[PDB]
Design a protein around this ligand. Structure first.
Ligand SMILES: Nc1ncnc2c1ncn2[C@@H]1O[C@H](COP(=O)(O)OP(=O)(O)O)[C@@H](O)[C@H]1O
Ligand SMILES: Nc1ncnc2c1ncn2[C@@H]1O[C@H](COP(=O)(O)OP(=O)(O)O)[C@@H](O)[C@H]1O
Ligand SMILES: Nc1ncnc2c1ncn2[C@@H]1O[C@H](COP(=O)(O)OP(=O)(O)O)[C@@H](O)[C@H]1O
Ligand SMILES: Nc1ncnc2c1ncn2[C@@H]1O[C@H](COP(=O)(O)OP(=O)(O)O)[C@@H](O)[C@H]1O
Ligand SMILES: Nc1ncnc2c1ncn2[C@@H]1O[C@H](COP(=O)(O)OP(=O)(O)O)[C@@H](O)[C@H]1O
Ligand SMILES: [Cl-]
Ligand SMILES: [Cl-]
Ligand SMILES: [Cl-]
Ligand SMILES: [Cl-]
Ligand SMILES: [Cl-]
Ligand SMILES: [Mn+2]
Ligand SMILES: [Mn+2]
Ligand SMILES: [Mn+2]
Ligand SMILES: [Mn+2]
Ligand SMILES: [Mn+2]
Ligand SMILES: [Mn+2]
Ligand SMILES: [Mn+2]
Ligand SMILES: [Mn+2]
Ligand SMILES: [Mn+2]
Ligand SMILES: [Mn+2]
Ligand SMILES: [Mn+2]
Ligand SMILES: [Mn+2]
Ligand SMILES: [Mn+2]
Ligand SMILES: [Mn+2]
Ligand SMILES: [Mn+2]
Ligand SMILES: [Mn+2]
Ligand SMILES: [Mn+2]
Ligand SMILES: [Mn+2]
Ligand SMILES: [Mn+2]
Ligand SMILES: [Mn+2]
Lengths: 362, 364, 362, 364, 362
């Protein structure tokens, strides 16, 4: 598969003229789901008679699973169940985005529905109020399948000046980042921040703190919003953990994590206990942390090493880093730096709970 | 060697504007800004706040990865950001903020390129004398091929003469950047005093001032950030190099105007002339404070518009190290102009040197 | 010197977003003056604490005369004294444009400050209320070939372009429309516009303006035109003969009346003024361009020929024309058709007063 | 105003070469060349002959339309062409010929721009003194937009210095024209003595000489024709304007070297110095003979590389009106150099003036 | 100074038609000399009545030294004395190329005439028959970025380009092939070629050349390279470090033997010569580029470091290398790896003789 240039050269002002027409009483709801790859998002739209006040008043829907690698033509309809509702930043109020769970012909969860089991697990431990903060790293890619703004058939200068950089020779693609940030605020996604990363054309947004199942919900809708923003601009966002081989930064999805007890005074005690637990389960977490069970991360994890578990205060080379502020106040949260940028947050967050809170072993 | 990238400037800017039009809701963006391991480069990142801060004191401390800015090691990387000065964000609009910070190491001591820490102390020592500064930031707009903006491909425009304070498609190159920057600075609350085209084509200038004490450095550094961010939108680069094009093409400085309460009062020329006398004994100390390479950058500029090895002063003399403007000479009160600072100086280093020499009576 | 392409290829939509930010309580004042060439306009901007209500509230300023061929680097400061204030059409209310007179280090007028003596002369005859109306002709230039002309060649022969309409007749009307509106917003007394005979050649009229204000309004109208052309990436030339041969030249025809010429039977005093003009032709030719005649020498071939004085009613071939309506009604004004398009209006208007009203000879 | 046309240079030149390869048979082409009503422009046309002429005397008279060259009226238009000098045609190859002609009016008197007629008579008057001339034709290669060939679009290259006798993609602009012209002139039988790059980028030079008497003008004019025809194939223009680019860019001349039998014999410097003395009394007459506008063209060049109003001479002095080359000074025999002639002079006018002043002892 | 595009877009087929015309009996001689920079080559052409059979039949000539920074306009003539003649590869038989020595108005050598003293030194040791072999490294440049490199960026890291083959490794071989053939036709003693480590970087070797002929052949080989590059519209740079950082620098390594070093057990005299070299390192660094060391200072970081002298067998990190074969066979030559690519060979070869054979000190 290749990028297609034609759409980005369409006249965008014409579109804005149409989008300015007042739409009347009817409401658009764009249903969003995960396909048979476990990585690709799909969407379509229905008109509703009036504005829903919450996710619960959205009707069930369905799609053709024989066109998403999930079912067979002769018995095709698959189920969509509203999970999380947001305001649509592409169409504006009263219009909605709806992230859904997918079920089979028999009402059984689809194989790539990882939210179903994750929600049960989060319910088991809600008394401990688990909070997550995920740092989505990504690379903008241009037309030729080469990173956005890089020289054709070539490389820019060595890494160094791009991290948190400003100027036409440092920051590539800030228009995407700015529009995504604002789109997430309007939607009601819990976007905590942004920065430029170390590889040129590589960028980052943070989603959090989100309690339990809302983590995966917010991150998946944030990813959807990014791809749709990028589409408008004609560029591609990749969550590949090592888009360019060699001495060019990979992309992760660092997962920050705390429990009520970790956040309370001297909760550093419970942080260290959780890290201890994680230290005995490194390979299980590696298999949960990218969609190919570790094969994607093997291209990135030279930052920490893929075979080795480590932990330390302010150590950006360790598997797990305790932020310096957390080490100082003796409470807060810790950072798992192992998740690949293309991980599924429902898989990552469930594994943390199972290892750290439900004391599963193996 | 780093080149610019053309791609970002060819993105559809009307698309960005439609997204920037969405009402953002109750949350507020704060972009923290700081100086990196080179002492010249600016860095930034953004967090979301619960509500609008009413003053810099309400903003939280933060941190960053110093191993990615040439400031710390990867295994012990977190470095501190402590808010110093807050402005309105002209790129995102109210309720959003820009936050210039100081940088501190893992052990809470100031980073090597944190020159505001000692400068603020010095300004506190002399606050009763109310030191005011005005700085004239000269710069050159550069294109995409490392060649000045608007210049012929692989060549030169006509000789210097018509471009200074010039008007027209064949005189003024890049006024769009200038106009946008002036308005971005007024919206932000940066104390922008004025603008002009300079003598080299594609070279411009803005003045920041009069700023009391430590606010000079603050306002200057935020003004430079704004300029980099404006040029970024347009796909051009601003260089503060003191001699971007060798030969008979104008260099770039950061002329620093200065007065105390006593120099501003009637007959304060007496105190202006005393301060200039102290400066004449410390030429070389000021040259080492007046660019990031200790004089090496200015050596390409200060040829004879003063020579780098000779100290001079005179009324209305744009060839001297120090100029007394004619109006100050006539009125027998005001300020004087140090024309020595390189365009790429750090205002914290320049302001502090002037105070140490002229007011704290240091020698050597 | 050549035009630079690049600024016209900057994204003008970006600038407009920045200019839409509310500026607050500070005010920009752009000071404008004439340089050592006597034809070049220079400008720069200062921030003010509040909005001035008339010109006399604005402060004196100064500039580097060593960068404008007016003084030496070692003693470089030159004075700017505000003379006339307008509203700024480029930055809007409350921002101002301010035409200044230039003075030397010793407070004496600069060589190219012709306003100083002109104002004194206008004051000596205030009771006769001289009004002036000036017709500024100019050509829009691209590469410096006229704007819209074939690359390395020529459009069809003159005939259809005068007051013309259509893609094949009117070259550059965008400029003309923007300029007209900018002048109305500024408070410049713009009286009308038209397309002239040479393709890419256009005209605006400033007037009727009393005494010293003619020079002020016309100089500010010229600055407005250069700045408007700048935005569009084109150049305006007031050269009297930009293209040699059988292509129209460019004048600044100067219409002139006193209170007496305007009252009933004022034609008597018009004819009396033209009679005084007939004896002083070479004096006026030397006043009527910055090279003392050598510029007009390229235009005044036949149009009147440079060394020959003539007057007639409705005669567009004469040095002086009395318009048909003025002849019919026996009152009004007459037209001096001799001034080059690059004349200084201070110089032209002073010469008319000295000859026609102060009865000077030699 | 006339511009060049780009279309002809984009035609497929390999196609032309295939046709030019056909053996042409027994018939011969003769291209007649003459000077038009401006005194500067060359014109040509071609006839077919029955066989190859062995000398210019075997070529027939011809004629043309003088109403189309600014020389005669449409109702009585035929004008005469009388062969003066024959060369081999380097554009069509042997057996084909180039024929420089004199122009004569309907009444068989010489055209107003026929300056060879009187010049030939003068040369006959002094043939016993064997006047030899060598002329240094300077010229500038111009592009397609009236701007010098290779120069940046709407701009200037780096300052003069490296381009004189220069080598490299960033020094030598247009050497293809030069190399082709040199070979075209040798094939033709034009007495080409040498070439060099000049001080302005895109400016070159060739020498024609030593030519006795009237052959100087002949060989020079045919060399210029060859140069125009070569540049035409390549799509560039050669200008003989004495100052194509105003300011600190080199002008173009046609330095005229000159000797008689007596100046060439041992101790002939004595006769060189006598001739230079006669020239010093007639500076203004020679300036009026030395460009087609009587001095007006050279006024843009001769600024001070001699001033137009002052006569000077010196050994090895490239700032003087007349230079005695060092080798001539040393050897006490040879020639001297008149550096005054404009690149656009007519060699018939220059050579004749030198003879009239130096040998026929005319005054005024 | 910038390259000019236009000449490379001229129709080169047109030129070849003209160069195919039989020239007749006259002969072109192109005289070549070194200018006031000590690095720039200058040339011009005279017609001769017949073909010279050796250099001594060619006449003296002269040039304008005021246009080459060697003399003043009012006394401008400088002498050219033919030194070495070659066949002209650009114009063919019977046409010649002629390297000259330059002299002042008073017959004394020009400041940048280093051949004069070098020849005298070579004559003092003719019986020892010094041979030299020089390895000229250079980079092909476009806009001045290296030729074939990405616009505003960088090719992949060094490794595959050395002695490389393929569109993705060898940049500019057309030049190298044409140059090699032109040198063989000329009679220049070209010994070989290769692609070097930096992409667009190449090398030719001239030698073994006895005494003064080394400087002559290498200077003529450099002129041939500049003229060949000119045809192709590219530029050759002998700068020692054209691209900063981790991109190969450029030397002119100088191999050196006397008759004694070449006979059996000559290694003894090699080692003896290197010993004399070890005491005079700074002398040679000052001889070994035109800025007396300041150019080599950009290259001699580590390659040897500028202030440190070292020698070893097969050591490409040393100042002096004794090749492996020379060590094995106990006879031959040694390599001085210190000379910058922009050295004057007259200067280098003279220094070797003075130090190693005339036993000079200080
Ligand atoms: N108590 C907490 N529990 C879980 N996550 C948290 C907590 N406090 C903050 N976070 C989240 O941690 C994340 C930190 O991301 P970031 O600022 O990129 O840190 P760094 O770059 O230092 O790793 C943010 O998403 C934030 O919302
Ligand atoms: N009393 C003062 N002390 C310090 N600075 C001052 C004082 N008065 C004015 N200034 C500042 O001096 C600067 C003058 O800059 P500019 O107008 O570029 O002057 P010039 O170009 O004539 O050197 C402005 O920033 C202004 O705010
Ligand atoms: N009484 C008057 N005194 C001076 N100028 C006048 C008077 N009445 C009109 N004018 C001016 O004369 C000018 C006429 O210009 P225009 O319409 O171009 O005339 P035309 O093209 O017929 O010569 C206008 O500027 C107008 O304001
Ligand atoms: N005895 C002579 N009489 C006339 N001309 C001569 C004589 N000897 C040489 N010449 C000519 O003088 C010209 C010298 O031109 P050139 O080499 O450009 O000299 P420079 O550039 O030093 O002025 C050549 O045309 C040459 O043929
Ligand atoms: N006896 C010798 N004396 C001087 N130079 C020699 C001798 N033998 C060979 N050479 C020269 O030494 C040079 C070796 O260059 P090259 O093949 O590039 O070597 P390397 O790449 O191994 O250093 C060639 O110019 C060759 O002619
Ligand atoms: Cl849809
Ligand atoms: Cl950010
Ligand atoms: Cl301004
Ligand atoms: Cl023909
Ligand atoms: Cl040549
Ligand atoms: Mn982060
Ligand atoms: Mn990150
Ligand atoms: Mn990182
Ligand atoms: Mn992190
Ligand atoms: Mn200033
Ligand atoms: Mn300035
Ligand atoms: Mn200045
Ligand atoms: Mn200043
Ligand atoms: Mn009119
Ligand atoms: Mn008109
Ligand atoms: Mn008209
Ligand atoms: Mn009129
Ligand atoms: Mn010459
Ligand atoms: Mn010459
Ligand atoms: Mn010359
Ligand atoms: Mn000459
Ligand atoms: Mn080698
Ligand atoms: Mn090598
Ligand atoms: Mn090597
Ligand atoms: Mn080697």
């Amino acid at each position: 598969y290749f990028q297609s240039m034609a759409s980005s050269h369409l006249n965008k002002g014409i579109k804005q003229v149409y989008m300015s027409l007042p739409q009347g009483e009817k409401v658009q709801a764009m249903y969003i789901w995960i396909d048979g790859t476990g990585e690709g998002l799909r969407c379509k739209t229905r008109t509703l008679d009036s504005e829903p006040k919450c996710v619960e008043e959205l009707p069930e829907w369905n799609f053709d699973g024989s066109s998403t690698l999930q079912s067979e033509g002769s018995n095709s309809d698959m189920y969509l169940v509203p999970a999380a509702m947001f305001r649509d930043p592409f169409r504006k109020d009263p219009n909605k985005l709806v992230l859904c769970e997918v079920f089979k012909y028999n009402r059984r969860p689809a194989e790539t529905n990882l939210r179903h089991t994750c929600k049960r697990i989060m319910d088991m431990v809600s008394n401990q109020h688990p909070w997550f903060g995920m740092e989505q790293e990504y690379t903008l890619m241009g037309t030729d399948g080469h990173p956005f703004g890089w020289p054709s058939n070539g490389f820019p200068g060595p890494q160094g000046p791009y991290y948190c950089g400003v100027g036409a020779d440092r920051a590539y693609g800030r228009d995407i980042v700015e529009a995504h940030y604002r789109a997430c605020l309007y939607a009601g996604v819990k976007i905590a921040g942004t920065n430029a990363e170390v590889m040129p054309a590589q960028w980052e947004f943070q989603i959090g703190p989100c309690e339990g199942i809302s983590m995966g919900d917010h991150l998946w809708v944030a990813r959807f919003i990014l791809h749709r923003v990028c589409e408008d601009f004609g560029v591609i966002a990749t969550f590949d953990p090592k888009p360019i081989p060699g001495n060019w930064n990979g992309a992760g999805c660092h997962t920050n994590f705390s429990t009520k007890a970790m956040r309370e005074e001297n909760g550093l005690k419970y942080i260290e206990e959780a890290i201890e637990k994680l230290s005995k389960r490194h390979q299980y977490h590696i298999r949960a942390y990218d969609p190919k069970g570790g094969l994607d991360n093997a291209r990135r994890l030279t930052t920490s090493n893929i075979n080795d578990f480590s932990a330390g205060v302010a150590n950006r080379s360790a598997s797990i880093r305790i932020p310096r502020t957390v080490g100082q106040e003796k409470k807060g949260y810790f950072e798992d730096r192992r998740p690949s940028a293309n991980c599924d947050p429902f898989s990552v967050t469930e594994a943390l709970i199972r290892t750290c809170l439900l004391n599963e072993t193996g």
